[PDB]
Structures are given as C-alpha cells and as structure tokens.
Amino acid sequence: GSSGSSGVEFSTLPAGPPAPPQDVTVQAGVTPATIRVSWRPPVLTPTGLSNGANVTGYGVYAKGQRVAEVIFPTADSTAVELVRLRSLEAKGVTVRTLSAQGESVDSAVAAVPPELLVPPTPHPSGPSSG
Helix, strand or coil, rough: CCCCCCCCCCCCCCCCCCCCCCEEEEEEECCCEEEEEEEEEECCCCCCCCCCCCCEEEEEEEECCEEECCCCCCCCEEEEHHHHHHHHHCEEEEEEECCCCCEEEEECCEEECCCCCCCCCCCCCCCCCC
C-alpha cells in the first residue's frame, strides 16, 4: 500500500542491514593459494542480532563476485581462494555481514598483498663458474 491505508493488526519492526565488520586484513591462508581475511565482528544483541537482523555469517567479495562465505556470525577470520582474485585481478577484498534478512555493505577493502597472491618457488640457479 503506497501511502494508501492499513488496519489489520500487525507489528513488523525493521531489521538490518547488519552492522558491517571492521579492521579487515589479510594474514595468510592455510594454503599458498588462499588467504585469511581477519576482521572484528560488531557486538551482537543478547538475543543474536547485529543491527536488528539475524546474522548467520559473513561473506568475502573481490570485484562484486562472492569468493568466500563463513557461516559464523562471531567469525573474526575466514579463508578465501586467491585464484578467484586472479581471474578478476582484484587487488583487495571486503567482508559483508550475512543475515537472514540479507547482506551488509562492504567492509574496508583489504588490499591483498602481492607476496601472498604470487605462488611459491624454489631457489633458482645457473652455471656455476666461480
């Protein structure tokens, strides 16, 4: 009802968007092909709600494409595939608070380091003359 009329007894309070995380950073992923996006989860009501919504977890994004998603509302770090960033050539990722209502804005784009983006390699060598 676009400014029409109402009456039917109904109480529906506004929910979300859920408060987005902060202090986003990339430490290191269990594997050389992944990373660890660490962040600080905002206090959740004594009932299980961030900004009025039911936070079920978080979600990592690079260039608008969900690369990773942790089903943990109290998660302070999640693993993300680096390859997913290559195809898109994304030099940074973000964390969004996922809830039953939807998702939240993109946290501080944590520019992934080039050292982690690049794969490992053994010490090279050549013709030893002197």
